[PDB]
Amino acid sequence: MAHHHHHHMGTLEAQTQGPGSMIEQIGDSEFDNKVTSCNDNILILVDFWAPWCGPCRSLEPQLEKLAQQYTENVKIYKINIEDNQDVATQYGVSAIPTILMFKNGKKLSQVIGADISKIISEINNNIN
């Protein structure tokens, strides 16, 4: 059963849809503005990039799977200022990519790597 192979070959984006669906893109000056000041108790998931997660390679991220169900309870945001945020250094993460979970101005959990079993565990912990 020992299956375990990631791919840090690079990144590949193909956001055919975004503003209005569930995965929105945000910038630096509005990052904290809508993420940290979020008092709606909704679960915000900010992610860096998509590791070849395109419809012509492997469009199968955990985010879609759960967001499709929990869309009204979750909001995924592309952190445009990915080139310069030591938040990853704060978490001390070394993986591609990484997703952080915010709610009520609080930090709940963070998706490191690609472990569906783990992401469902942490996400379902903080939402219904």
Distance between terminal CA atoms of the chain?
31
φ and ψ of 93, to 5 deg:
-85, 145
Spatial separation of the C-alpha atoms in residues 128 and 94, rounded to whole Å: 29
Q: Sheet containing 43-47: give its strands across.
A: 23-26, 74-79, 43-47, 98-103, 106-112
Q: So which residues are the catalytic ones?
A: 53, 56
Q: Which amino acid is at 103?
A: K
Strands 74-79 and 23-26: parallel
As given in the structure block, the two tokens for residue 71 are 């869309």
Spatial separation of the C-alpha atoms in residues 14 and 21, rounded to whole Å: 14
**What residue segments make up the domains of the chain, in order of their start?**
1-128
Q: Which helix (H) or strand (E) holds 66?
A: helix 62-70
Task: Give the technique used to solve this structure.
Answer: NMR
Contacts 24+ apart (CB under 8 A), 88-92: 88/48
Q: Are 103 and 43 in contact (CB under 8 A)?
A: yes
Q: Are 41 and 104 in contact (CB under 8 A)?
A: yes
As given in the structure block, the two tokens for residue 114 are 């690609």
Spatial separation of the C-alpha atoms in residues 98 and 51, rounded to whole Å: 10
Q: Are 38 and 103 in contact (CB under 8 A)?
A: yes
